[PDB]
Design a protein around this ligand. Structure first.
Ligand code: HEM
Ligand code: HEM
Ligand SMILES: CCOc1ccc(-c2ccc3c(C)cc(N)nc3c2)cc1CN
Ligand SMILES: CCOc1ccc(-c2ccc3c(C)cc(N)nc3c2)cc1CN
Ligand SMILES: C[C@H](O)[C@H](O)[C@H]1CNc2nc(N)[nH]c(=O)c2N1
Ligand SMILES: C[C@H](O)[C@H](O)[C@H]1CNc2nc(N)[nH]c(=O)c2N1
Ligand SMILES: [Zn+2]
Lengths: 414, 408
């Protein structure tokens, strides 16, 4: 690499200079001769000697941020951690470092358009948790807090870190709140097709399914390497929104609703070499996540045709753009419904405008902002949002959120 | 290693081996991805490039290592020695131009790549001659609405002071004017070019859709102005199948998309004038040309006549207006029997093209950022299609705008 890299916005001609990319850590999958920018996931513990430089890197960074770099406290903190690694093969983050790391993993999340909010994250320290019941307790408190009767607040709950890899804490759910999917014998799918596999695991562990279209899944929670356990989220904690349209009376007749709180629970949080395998986090929805993907993906709820039929569109040509017309109304309904019920939501125009402002500010104050164009650009109306025209650099900074294998493919059953 | 690409909607997985044959750089590194950056020889360097190309050509016709193959190499070697350059056989030129299209990672239309009419204009010596070839091209490609893919190839670069250039970015494009009050009349993307043409003697009608003159440079001389015979320029008035008031907007567009400012690289040879043309995907006009902020910017006006709530962005009034404009564009072209393709059919075809290419070639370079349409992305099949991007040659390359380089 060279020291400086420029990016240009083709709509406004603004040019930004990236220096932060020099602090890049892991690989991207790309080389000089091939780019993997549209590959979803490009490509057991760590040793003592693997861990010293990783912890030091994070500690320096942290003390650099609080304007105390090379201080007495900095050096004493380093001495402490180095001994702890030497005598236990791991170490413990202070409460302040854990909070710094969690906020910075969000800040460094190149596929997140919502990062203008990164510094307003409520961090719940759950490192004292020992059992699955305890996890359930922590998670209920998270959901209630974050939901806040519609006034959603971003939060993250962090469970104890990996030790030897045989005592992992995991949320088996991919999100804290999701709807169930039931593969029918006739090949059809009732509910959310994305969650069919997880639903079956839940039923096997003893879940009694209502077998409806929008059944909130049970939490499946694993503590300290033990077999996972099922708990029902109290229903009064799950905020939902029926979907209606500001002009089409019949839209309520489709019987659609969604949950208010998006809370991913299957990713891994990496801070200074430590691996927090259970770290559910939540913010609020962008309209299209629900309106476009969850509702109109062919392999999700796939309602485009049924909506188009009631709109009385011509559906035999594709050049009538009947799909495109229905899609827009669907997203109008979603936004209308959330707004009317005073539940926090952002439309893709507002969110993308905010990200550009956020990204410019990060370039001035931080020397860059990793961003994944393929993910940052919304799934509809791409070129009429300002991110479409913005050049972006992608690279991996630490602390960070990573993907991790599904726990059922790994778990050694007790 | 072999690499896999998965379509997440159909779960189809293809295996890429073609990338191993790639030789040009992409712009990325192991640490930084530049997938969304728009723009990331002497005797000595020339023969290996020449040899590589001739090798792959004779490979393509199943005569690799033949007598003809060796003799061709010897011929190209001796010619590079004695002249510092070499000339391509007619067949090599046609193979070359088709494969530059085939390798064009940003092009969603490559299912058509081997159906390409190639006009060899390498005997051309003057701007007038260029004008001639270009009119013949436009007439052939337009074909009274039944558009036919073509490219016209002018003489290759030599010492770099005798370049052939088409100064237009496209053969047919509308003028753009800087108004006294600051606004722009017409296409803002062409305001600078329009000013260069007026500086050179062009008398502008100063309307919203004025077809620009050709500005042709031959052998490195000052460019010259030419008027395309108006009977060769096919245009479509844009009207809407439900909204009768839409014609009142007075929008039109030209039928023939003909990019003329790029460089064709074959076997180490640089062709700096090589205008090529196909037909439009609707969104190119109905999303980008009409609704970009820096373009004609008509969303607001259309949403007015649709009488939508334009106070909040969360009414998605822009999105609604946008779909209607693209309905109008498709509807108008089809009613005028002018070849056009909607982004659903075109992305569907590309997925099928990928399938064929992985089968017969062991891969297909594709730029996901450019292949996904600028509206309704995830309801087209390419959104969910993983792609590998890498640079194969022959290729189309960007080159600097001529006015930054030329000395008059
Ligand atoms: C508060 C408002 C937020 C908004 C509007 C928002 C928006 C989004 C969207 C739209 C995506 C892409 C999801 C998709 O299309 O599939 C995304 C990705 C992501 N976000 Fe945010 N998000 C928010 C909060 C957060 C928070 C609080 C965190 C972490 C503390 C976070 C971390 C991430 C990560 C790690 C991804 C990438 C997920 C992946 O790799 O699949 N986000 N965000
Ligand atoms: C026949 C119908 C064709 C269709 C529907 C088509 C479609 C497209 C589209 C939609 C783009 C993206 C343009 C943009 O969004 O700005 C594109 C780019 C491109 N097309 Fe095709 N194309 C066709 C024919 C051709 C031909 C005949 C050639 C050359 C022989 C060609 C070479 C290219 C190249 C090199 C690009 C990339 C432009 C760049 O890198 O700046 N296309 N095409
Ligand atoms: C393609 C499926 O993969 C994802 C898709 C979306 C997200 C994700 C993750 C976090 C979010 C958050 C925190 C807020 C929000 N509005 N949307 C979010 C979306 C995560 C993942 C990772 N499993
Ligand atoms: C800054 C954007 O640059 C481009 C974008 C698109 C194209 C292009 C090039 C050829 C096309 C062809 C041949 C057909 C078609 N329908 N669209 C085409 C579009 C060229 C260029 C290069 N001037
Ligand atoms: C193939 C492609 O990489 C994949 O479908 C991506 C494209 N961009 C995306 N962008 C967002 N925000 N979310 C996604 O799930 C995806 N999916
Ligand atoms: C920043 C980004 O690379 C740039 O705006 C690209 C994005 N994708 C595109 N895709 C197409 N087909 N045409 C374009 O001009 C662009 N512009
Ligand atoms: Zn890359």
């Amino acid at each position: 690499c060279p020291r400086f890299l420029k990016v240009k916005n083709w709509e406004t001609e603004v040019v930004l200079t990236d220096t932060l990319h020099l602090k890049s850590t892991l690989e991207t999958g790309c080389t000089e001769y091939i780019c993997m920018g549209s590959i979803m996931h490009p490509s057991d513990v760590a040793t003592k000697d693997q861990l010293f430089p990783l912890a030091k890197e994070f500690i320096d960074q942290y003390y650099s941020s609080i304007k105390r770099f090379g201080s007495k406290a900095h050096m004493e903190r380093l001495e402490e951690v180095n001994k702890e690694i030497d005598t236990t093969s791991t170490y413990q983050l202070k409460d302040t470092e854990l909070i710094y790391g969690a906020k910075h993993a969000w800040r460094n999340a190149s596929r997140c358009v919502g990062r203008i909010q990164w510094s307003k994250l409520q961090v719940f320290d759950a490192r004292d948790c020992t059992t699955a019941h305890g996890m359930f307790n922590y998670i209920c408190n998270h959901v209630k807090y974050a939901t806040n009767k519609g006034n959603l607040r971003s939060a993250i709950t962090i469970f104890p870190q990996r030790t030897d890899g045989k005592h992992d804490f995991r949320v088996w759910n991919s999100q804290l709140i999701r709807y169930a999917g039931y593969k029918q014998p006739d090949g059809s799918t009732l509910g959310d097709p994305a969650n069919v596999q997880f639903t079956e695991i839940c039923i096997q562990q003893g879940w009694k399914p209502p077998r409806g279209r929008f059944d909130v899944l049970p939490l499946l929670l694993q503590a300290n390497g033990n077999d996972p356990e099922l708990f029902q989220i109290p229903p009064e904690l799950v905020l939902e929104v029926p979907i209606r349209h500001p002009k089409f009376e019949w839209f309520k007749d489709l019987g659609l609703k969604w949950y208010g709180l998006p809370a991913v629970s299957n990713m891994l949080l990496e801070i200074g070499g430590l691996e927090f395998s259970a770290c559910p986090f939540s913010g609020w929805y962008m309209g299209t996540e629900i309106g476009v993907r969850d509702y109109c993906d062919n392999s999700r709820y796939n309602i485009l045709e049924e909506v188009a039929k009631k709109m009385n569109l011509d559906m035999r040509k594709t050049s009538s753009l009947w799909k495109d017309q229905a899609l827009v109304e669907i997203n109008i309904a979603v936004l209308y419904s959330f707004q009317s019920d005073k539940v926090t939501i952002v439309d893709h125009h507002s969110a993308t405008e905010s990200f550009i402002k956020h990204m410019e500010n990060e370039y001035r104050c931080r020397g860059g902002c990793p961003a994944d164009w393929v993910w940052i650009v919304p799934p509809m109306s791409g070129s009429i949002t300002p991110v479409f025209h913005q050049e972006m650099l992608n690279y991996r900074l630490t602390p960070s959120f990573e993907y991790q294998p599904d726990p059922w493919n790994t778990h050694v059953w007790k």
